């Protein structure tokens, strides 16, 4: 792979703009796949409450649903507070 290295070196000296464009394009694809923070971007969009959280009627069979907003049940946002 010494033939390409001379090719890439010449392209860097003579067509640097195109070399940067292709490198940036390749980095943009790669970075979301290897970043540890990629998962949080969807989670942050999911935690933004644009709509009223309509309560549910309590039927006596909801051990997981909080009865008050300061109950220890329901989705916590500690992960975002310390992000």
């Amino acid at each position: 792979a010494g033939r390409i290295s001379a090719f890439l070196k010449n392209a860097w000296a003579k067509e640097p703009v195109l070399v940067v464009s292709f490198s940036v394009w390749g980095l943009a694809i790669i970075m979301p796949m290897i970043s540890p923070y990629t998962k949080y971007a969807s989670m942050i969009n999911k935690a933004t409450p644009y709509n009223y959280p309509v309560p549910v009627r309590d039927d006596g069979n909801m051990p997981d649903v909080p009865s008050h907003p300061q109950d220890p049940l329901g989705p916590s946002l500690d992960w975002l507070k310390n992000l």
Partner: protein
């Protein structure tokens, strides 16, 4: 109402300057003064004859590229989606195909002006 008000004032100010410029100065109209300028000699033809466009292909490519950016300008709202992976793939694919289209036209000499 406010945006309408200020733009009307902007229109009003511009039109007043035009009226002043046309009615304040002393005039002296005669044919040689009002004939079209061409470096002291008369034109040999109308300026209304066809004027060739050597970049006509770039021009109609610009029409398609201008609808491509129209497809990109919702991106600030689209990044708010829960479906981040879907949005990201759609945006990446959209930009890449537009790049491939530009790359093809570039290698076909479509950006070179005609002679």
């Amino acid at each position: 109402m406010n945006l309408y008000t200020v733009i009307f004032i902007n229109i009003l100010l511009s039109l007043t300057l035009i009226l002043v410029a046309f009615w304040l100065p002393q005039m002296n109209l005669y044919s040689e003064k009002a004939n079209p300028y061409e470096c002291g000699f008369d034109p040999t033809s109308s300026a209304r004859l066809p004027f060739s466009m050597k970049f006509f292909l770039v021009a109609i490519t610009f029409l398609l590229f201008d609808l491509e950016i129209a497809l990109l300008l919702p991106l600030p709202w689209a990044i708010q989606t829960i479906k981040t992976s879907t949005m990201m793939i759609m945006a990446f694919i959209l930009v890449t195909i537009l790049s491939l289209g530009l790359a093809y036209e570039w290698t076909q000499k479509g950006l070179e002006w005609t002679e």
